[PDB]
Each structure stands twice: as structure tokens, then as C-alpha cells.
Design a protein around this motif. Sequence first.
Motif, PDB file in Angstrom:
ATOM      1  N   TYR A  84     -24.384 -94.640  51.662  1.00 38.76           N
ATOM      2  CA  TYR A  84     -25.363 -93.861  52.436  1.00 38.76           C
ATOM      3  C   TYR A  84     -24.953 -92.427  52.799  1.00 38.76           C
ATOM      4  CZ  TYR A  84     -28.266 -98.030  53.159  1.00 38.76           C
ATOM      5  OH  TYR A  84     -29.065 -99.141  52.998  1.00 38.76           O
ATOM      6  N   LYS A  85     -25.942 -91.622  53.194  1.00 35.58           N
ATOM      7  CA  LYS A  85     -25.708 -90.232  53.584  1.00 35.58           C
ATOM      8  C   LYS A  85     -25.851 -90.082  55.087  1.00 35.58           C
ATOM      9  CE  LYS A  85     -27.085 -87.804  49.263  1.00 35.58           C
ATOM     10  NZ  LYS A  85     -28.225 -87.316  48.415  1.00 35.58           N
ATOM     11  N   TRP A 117     -26.992 -92.881  48.796  1.00 30.43           N
ATOM     12  CA  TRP A 117     -25.937 -92.079  48.194  1.00 30.43           C
ATOM     13  C   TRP A 117     -25.413 -92.791  46.966  1.00 30.43           C
ATOM     14  CZ3 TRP A 117     -20.238 -91.871  50.254  1.00 30.43           C
ATOM     15  CH2 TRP A 117     -19.472 -91.084  49.367  1.00 30.43           C
ATOM     16  N   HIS A 143     -21.165 -99.346  53.630  1.00 33.35           N
ATOM     17  CA  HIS A 143     -22.264 -98.609  54.238  1.00 33.35           C
ATOM     18  C   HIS A 143     -22.084 -97.090  54.188  1.00 33.35           C
ATOM     19  CE1 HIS A 143     -23.880-102.365  55.358  1.00 33.35           C
ATOM     20  NE2 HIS A 143     -24.578-101.952  56.402  1.00 33.35           N
ATOM     21  N   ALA A 144     -20.883 -96.601  54.476  1.00 30.62           N
ATOM     22  CA  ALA A 144     -20.635 -95.167  54.436  1.00 30.62           C
ATOM     23  C   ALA A 144     -20.496 -94.694  52.998  1.00 30.62           C
ATOM     24  CB  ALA A 144     -19.391 -94.841  55.201  1.00 30.62           C
ATOM     25  N   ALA A 157     -25.246 -95.249  57.382  1.00 30.06           N
ATOM     26  CA  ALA A 157     -23.873 -94.998  56.987  1.00 30.06           C
ATOM     27  C   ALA A 157     -23.008 -94.957  58.230  1.00 30.06           C
ATOM     28  CB  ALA A 157     -23.765 -93.686  56.226  1.00 30.06           C
ATOM     29  N   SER A 208     -22.804 -98.863  44.441  1.00 30.74           N
ATOM     30  CA  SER A 208     -21.840 -98.424  45.450  1.00 30.74           C
ATOM     31  C   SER A 208     -20.752 -99.502  45.534  1.00 30.74           C
ATOM     32  CB  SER A 208     -22.509 -98.280  46.824  1.00 30.74           C
ATOM     33  OG  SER A 208     -23.555 -97.332  46.807  1.00 30.74           O
TER      34      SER A 208
END
Lengths: 443, 100, 421, 220
Positions: C150-151, C222, C146-147, C155, C405
Motif C-alpha cells: 500500500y501507499k 502499491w 500491508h506497508a 499501509a 506484494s
Amino acid sequence: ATYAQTLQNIPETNVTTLDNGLRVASEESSQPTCTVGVWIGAGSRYENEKNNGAGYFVEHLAFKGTKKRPCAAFEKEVESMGAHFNGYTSREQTAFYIKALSKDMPKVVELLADVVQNCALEESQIEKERGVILQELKEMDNDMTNVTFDYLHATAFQGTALARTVEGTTENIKHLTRADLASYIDTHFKAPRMVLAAAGGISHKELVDAARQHFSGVSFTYKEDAVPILPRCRFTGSEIRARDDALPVAHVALAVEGPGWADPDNVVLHVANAIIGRYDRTFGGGKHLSSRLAALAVEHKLCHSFQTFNTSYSDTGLFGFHFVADPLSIDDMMFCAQGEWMRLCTSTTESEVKRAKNHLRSAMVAQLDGTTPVCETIGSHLLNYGRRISLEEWDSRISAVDARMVRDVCSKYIYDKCPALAAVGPIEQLLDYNRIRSGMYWI
Amino acid sequence: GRLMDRIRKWYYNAAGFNKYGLMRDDTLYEDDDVKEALKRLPKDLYNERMFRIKRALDLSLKHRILPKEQWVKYEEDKPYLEPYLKEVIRERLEREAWNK
Amino acid sequence: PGAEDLEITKLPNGLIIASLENFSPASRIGVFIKAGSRYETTANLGTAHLLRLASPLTTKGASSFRITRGIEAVGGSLSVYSTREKMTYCVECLRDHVDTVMEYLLNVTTAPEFRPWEVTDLQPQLKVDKAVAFQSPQVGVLENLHAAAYKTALANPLYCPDYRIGKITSEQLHHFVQNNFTSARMALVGIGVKHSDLKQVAEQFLNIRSGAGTSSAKATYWGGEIREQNGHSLVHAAVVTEGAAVGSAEANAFSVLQHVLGAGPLIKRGSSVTSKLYQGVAKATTQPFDASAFNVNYSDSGLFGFYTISQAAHAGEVIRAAMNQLKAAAQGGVTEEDVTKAKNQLKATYLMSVETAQGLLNEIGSEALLSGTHTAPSVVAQKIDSVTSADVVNAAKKFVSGKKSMAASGDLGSTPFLDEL
Amino acid sequence: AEQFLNIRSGAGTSSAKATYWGGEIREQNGHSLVHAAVVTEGAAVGSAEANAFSVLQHVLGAGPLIKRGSSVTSKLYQGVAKATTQPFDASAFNVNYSDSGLFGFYTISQAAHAGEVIRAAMNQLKAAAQGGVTEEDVTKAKNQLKATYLMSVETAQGLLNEIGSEALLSGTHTAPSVVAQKIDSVTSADVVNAAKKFVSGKKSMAASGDLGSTPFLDEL
């Protein structure tokens, strides 16, 4: 509408027997999905020194195919209809069951009947499931909670058959033979000892109909209609301590001899066990929990977790508790516990029980949360109690219990009884059977 | 009436814990409830109570008091604990009556 | 009285009420809410998490004590469940007691006092509550993914980060409730109850006004990688890409492509041949491993890919095979029949999820909160088969093209980087 | 060395050739300041192409020379002050490894300005990679570099390190007049190129602190 009534609307559970021994039962609902399974009264308890590990080695191959449809075919045909096939095998109760759409109610039963009866048993498959069981051990060995409970059995019933691990010995799993596996299936998987149970959106008749067709095997001699009664298992006050100060925590398990499935006392006992309940680090309850022991456990960082248990069997059973703690609190904890046990036998109040009851009540209700668990209740009920016990009944049996009742039963089973003790870990702080025995009276 | 009110003020100057700079609730005996209360005090209010006492103690050891102009005055006396306490006590009273 | 009907009123302030009397001996009331660690800003992290454990803390109408002793007194239970974007407070108990268990359920979610001390005295729990969950590498890799995908918002980690343990405040919590647990973002769903009771109670007691309070930072994608070397024996891995949103008819495709690649076993100690991915991997790896289809659907985004677990030496090939099996799937290697099967598995899985009182109260809730509607079981099954072999072959393509990702953990010595697939 | 040393010879175990990756690692820690360094493959050791960076290093400003100074001979520094209002700090990063190296800048700033301070750090590197380097800035950085080096030979420790490194990577020793020669043998082009070899290649980033208003690599 009140609770008392929602209780009596629950559809009476139907049952009928085939002239070969099998018994069929199931509770009808509205759900489009459902679960069905065979509940064999088999297990290691029925095993001996040479075949310890059959019920398991079998439970392992009962899903790798039959003679009609080998490996792939079996799985393929099952997966392709969304059904779920799982199973297990305790010391005295194996079981194979499937979850699937009420639509496939019949086709399912066919399959169940195909595993229990026409299990494949390919020689290439066994010598492969051999290496695997052997691995599910190196692993299951690191589950202290279970490494303990086995040891508890291994010495509480020591010397008997009950005192064996379900997964069986290392030597046995290394030498069992197509032959030996066969016999287990042949000698144990027999209709008068099996139960076809199911719950969901199914018609009782529709169900039985399928049974009549695949669960054929009609018998000749009286032998085949007879349920071999089992040899009694001798309880023995004692302990077995497995030390390894290299482990993070230590597990301890204390127990007395249980009453045995049938006894109406098990009710009282479960009411009791509710009073003390259980606790565990994450419990948001905290210092306000109602369980004295839970409360103390928290205030003094006594233990990572503890629990009460009332394992019951055909003729006997274990009754006690198990806790996990730091090498430096095993003592204090143990002590607090044995005390709460005493409290039970000497000063349980009407409040302590009032709560306990309501707790047990909804616990038993959550035992019937879904098709699989409802089914399981039936499979087990018939096989143990010899019929089905309605929540309407279970509930009445609880409404009966009050202080006096508990005090006498717990005394009846706990007070001044030589206990079975099993400890595992960096267990030095806890150190004396005697001292423990001494804690069985006055509180 | 305005008797208890002109009485209390007297007694207050009478007990004379002000001469040491101690608020009414600084002189409280620390039983279990108080103890509990004191722990609930906001960081500062506590560090402040602290000083006052460690200072009063320093006095009693020297045998002196505060010059007239630094004494607490009956109406400027802050009951910084009374509320937290009545709560502890209120809380306790419950647990107790509930265990029946 | 077997069959009743599912009601669902919607008060003025926007408080959706979902009922359903199924006459089971026990009820299960709950308060779903548009809340979570997605509305957290850098400055107030994990305050979502703590709020979850702060559940038993005193309210303006009941003490930390009375709440726990009061509920246990009836054989009750109180539990809080939350996703990155949805909190769920719900009690369970016997019918004749629901009256009383409610007071607390209400008091907890509507009138918390968050006393300075009860709180600072509870923070150390985070250290713990967090340490248990993390015993499962399963969850560690998800946090990072998730982190790493994502931004913002999504995240944000679901378990308060380590640095912030003990620095959360009473104000911080409050402003998280006043600014999120508003009537328009709340749903009072209940089973084993009459819609008349649930409603009456919802209105005569509930306060806190409506309004989205504080909108959530739109989910910006991201697409990066997070590799965590830890010497551990097995390598967990999940490679995913932007998926669908909750409700897009496109989302149902993946939900089918999910089952098409094999998303879990159905036979204990099985082989799962109806699993392209699984079987696809076994034809490359020799030692024990495990692979499956990953799929999540969030209000304004979602994720999709596969998740592996293997020995560190084969970790590589096991992941590469996981891709090649996804490509040969995104390119016309999907039998019009594989699609027909995945449809049942999906119809099934769903249907069995409505068996457990908890599983039902969740379906009713989610729906009853994101739209205040309830799509019959025959309609849902309709939006399922309304899937074409194309939607699937496309879902599989929407994957191989977009930015990917990745996330790992374990002896990643022979494990591959995202840029090497 | 001879009469007493034993352990046999041989390169023993070769080292895994340095493969370049180029990713970002952001560490949220609530800390008050945001540190950051954005770099790209640089030159290696002894590879002529380094001396350029070593000069482009000083050209962008690689540290202060006046206590509590302003350092105007620092493009980067000065370049950032013309964008940020509150206290901060930035400089030229440069490392040279046997089979690789790194190059870029390193910032440190308040968390709210962290963004612009880094962005400015870039635009100041572009306007530098594009003919915005006075043939004189280059003449200065050459002394600063001749200097810095020369003062590093003062501390017995500093000397034994220069002698060693060289004496181990080649078993040779380049006189101080030869090194200074390979320094001025730098052209304004080598520099403007160094600055270019940067804006094109794959960049790697690193952070730590309240990265709430800090930017991602993909946003530069």
C-alpha cells in the motif's frame, strides 16, 4: 428479566446409561452446529514406570486412522464435511471430540466410536509418531510455565504416579511398542469409564440411538462393569530448584495439598483464589486493580505475571500460585504473595469476598461459552462429580460463601502447612525452604 | 464581606514571601499531595517555579531581598498550583472513602 | 422463552442500535466504530494505538480509579478491539449489573479527558504492549506486507511505530476522537439485552454529533516487497494481490477459493488432504513446514494470497511450490466437487463463529455498522452456494496476473525475490 | 613482504557475482528532513564506460567549490532551485565496483517539498539525457575532474590510496598524464548516453524521514 431466572431456563442436562457402562449426556439448544465427544477417564495417572507415555502416543495415533478407513480416508471424510476433530490427554482424563453441524450428529458419533474402539495403529505410523513426540518435547521443554508446573507435580506428589509428566519419559517414547500401545487402549478405553457428551441443536434420543448402535461391546463378567479404584498419592512438603542464570526470567510455583474433586470446599477455595486473582504486564487495570497483590506487583515492578490455581483430582489436588519475575525481584514478590495468602486466612473482609463471588460467578458462566466448552463441562462433570452441576446450583453454592467461611477454609488448607516448591531459572534471590515454611504463619 | 478581603491582603504583605519573589504557592510545604501535584505541572510552569526558589534560596543565603519594584503584589499573585492540588486531594479523598 | 427476534433501530443522528435477547445469564454490550490507523496521517501515527490503551483513563464522569474498581466490583471486563479500520469497545458481565457497567462503557467512548499526565505516564506501555505482540513473527510479517502492498491508510501499521513512542499528545488523541467517533460512525450492539433499554440509554446519554468527520484517504495499491533478514530459524512469507471489498459478490469467491487451497487444519496434528496448497507443498518439500490461504476484505480494497512458514533452506522451493499450486489451480484444475466441499467448510466455519458470545457480537456489529442491516443466516448461506466453478477459477486467475506484494522475515538466504516467481 | 609474510595464496573464496535487483526501501522516521537517492546500475571499475559517468557526474553538479555557494556549473542543483523555494540540496551519485556500480542523484530537502525536489531531480536528468549538454559543459567538467583527482594526491593518505587501489587491481600504475588522457578521450555522446543509460534501466530508490509527501519509485 433478572439473572436468577436466565439461570433456571437453561435446559436440564439429560443422561442415560447403556447396560455396558457407557453413559450418555447432552444439552439441547437451537444452534445448527454442535460438538460431541468421548470423555475417557484415562491418563498417565493410570500409567506405570514401563508405559509412561501411552495416553499420549495414543492421542497421537487416534487421528491417523482406523482399520475400516485408513489415514487419508479418515481425514478426507472428516474434512469434507467441515467437522473439527481435536483431543487431549491430562494425567487423569483423556478426551476425543468433534465439532460439526447438528445435521451430521449421527455420522459423527460413528467416527468417535471408531477411533476409541477400532484405532488403526499401523507399524509404519508409530515409528514415525515416535520421532515427532520426541520433537514436541525439545519444544515443550522451552515453555518454562509448564516445565515448572510439571516439576511442581514431580515433587509435590513425588514418588507417586501423579508425579509424572503426561508426555512421558524419553526412554519410554523411544521404546514403546505396538503391543504396549494396544494394551493401554484395551485396558483403559472401556465404556463404563467413557462418556458420550454433546451440546447443540440435537435431540437427546437421536443421540443415544447412535450410541446403542456403535458403542456395542456388551460385557459378561462383573470385572468389566468395575471402575478400578486408584492408589492414593502422597503429598510431600518439599522443593526442587532447577537453576540456569542464563534464562531471562525465573518461574516459581508454590502449593499445598488440594481437597479433591468431590469436596464442597473447593467452592470456597475458588472464591478465595478470586480475591487474589491474577495479573500480567498488559493488564490495563494498573495500580487501581483490586487484587492487593496485583496492586503491589505493579507499584514495585514485582513480576511479569502471576496466577492462582486450584487444580483438583479424584482424591487430591494442588493449590497455590505461580509467578514469573526478574532475578532481582523474585524475593520481594514471593514475600508479598505468601503475605496475601496469610491475609486470606486472617482478615478477609465481606467486601473482598463480595467482589470475588461476582467474579467467580461470571467466570464459571464463560466456561459455558459455546458448544465445545459446554460439552467439556459435561464430559468432565459426569466423569468427576458423577452427574451434572447446573449453574443454578453452582451459583447457589457461591451465594453461600462469606468472609468467615474463607478465613476458616484457607486456614484449614494453608496455615502452617509444609509447601511444595518448584523454581526455575536464574533463581538465586529466592533461597530458602525454611524461610518459606516460616512464611506460612502469622499475617 | 470586603473585610476578609482587606484582611487577606494585609496578612499577605505581612507574611512577606513576596519580598523574595515567591508566589503564594511557592512557599507551600511539600507533603505527598503537593509532591504529586507538582509532578502534574506543565513543563514550563515547573521550570519557572524552580528558578524562583533557587533564586529565593540564593537570597536567603546572601541575607538580602528583592528591590521594592520586583516584589509580588497581592493581586498579581498567580495560584498556579491550587487547582492541581485540590484535584489530587479530591482524587485521594475518593480512594480513601471507597476502601470500606 | 427460547426464540425472540433480532431488532435494530436507527436514530436520527445515525446511531445504529442492534439488540438481541438470547436469555444467557450474561450480557455483552459494545460500541463499534469506524476508527483505526487508516485515518492516521504521517504527522500523527500510532495515535490510534495509544487511544486503545488509553481506554482506562479518566473521563468527565469517572476516575481512572473508579472505572477499574467500579467494574471489577461486579466481576466485569472491559476490552478494546481494533482492525486497521474498526475499533470495538465492549464490556461483559452478569445481567443484573449491566446498568452500571454501561456508565463506564459510555463514559469511556464519549467523554474522555485525556489528561496530559495520565497520558505521558502511560506512553511507555506502547513500547511494551508492542514488544509482546511481536513475539509472534506471525504479526511482524503482516505489518510489513500491508506497508509493502500500500501507499496509504491501510499501509499504516497497527502498532505505533518505534520512533513515535512517547511523542503522541493529548490534543492529537482528542482530534482523533472528535474527528472519528461520531454518531454516524458508531454502533451500539448488544447481547442478552432488551432493545428498549439499549435504545433508551443510547439516546438519553449519547451526544457527539454525526458526519464522517474526516474521510479516509482512498486505498491506493502499491505492490512492493519487504524482506527482513533476522537470522531467525524459520522463514515466514506471504505473497498476495489486490482482492475484494467488503460486500462485493466477488469477495465470496476468494472466501471459497480460500478453502479450496486449504486455509488451516481441522484435525489436530493432521495432514489436511482437502488442502490443495498444503498437500501441494508436501509433494516438493521433505522437512516440516506449513502453508495456507491468506484472505482479507477491507471496505475499499482487500488482499489475497498464501502464507508459508518453513526451514530456511527449503524456504525457496516451499514458496515456489506455493505458486505453481496456485497456477495449476487458476487453470481448470478445480473439481466441481472441490467447490462443493469448500462450501460446507465455509458454511460451517462461519456458523461455529457465532457460538462464542464474542464471536456473535462481532458478526452482528460489523454488519450493523457497515449497513445497519442484518442478513439472515439462510441468506448468507445462499450467497455462498451462489458461487460458480468459474468465479473460483477466475479468483485464482485474478491472482496470477495482477501485481503481487511480498513479505518475509528470517534467514532469507535461500529465500526468493518477488521477481523470481 | 617476502621474508616475513606467510598466509598462502589463491583467490581463496570467489565472491558471489553481483546480481542487480532494483527495488525501493522507504524508512518512515518522523525526522525533519528527507534524504533520498535514486540510482541505476552504473559502470564498473576501470571499464571505459565509467569515465563517462565520472564526467556526467560533474556535468550534473557533484558538490560545491565555493563555501556557501550557488554552484551554477551544477545542472542538477540549479535545476532544482528553479522549482523549490526553501533550503535543500542535491547532487550526482556515482560508485564503481569491480563487477558492477551505481549511478544517480542524491537529494536532501524539507519534507513538504521532498516530492518536487526529487521530481525536478529527474526532469533535470532527462532534459540532460536528451541533447541538452553543451559541448562546452563537457569541456569544463573535464577540468573539474582533472582537478579533483589531482588534489586527492596531496594528502599522504590520498596518495597511498590511489597507488594502492591500482597496485592491487592490476599491479600496474597509469601515469598522471595517461589518466588525464582517458579523461578528455570522452565524447559528448558518451555523456548524453550515460545520461540515457539511466532513464531506461531499472531504478533503485532509498529514503528516510517524514516521507509523507515524498514520492514512490513508480511515480517518476
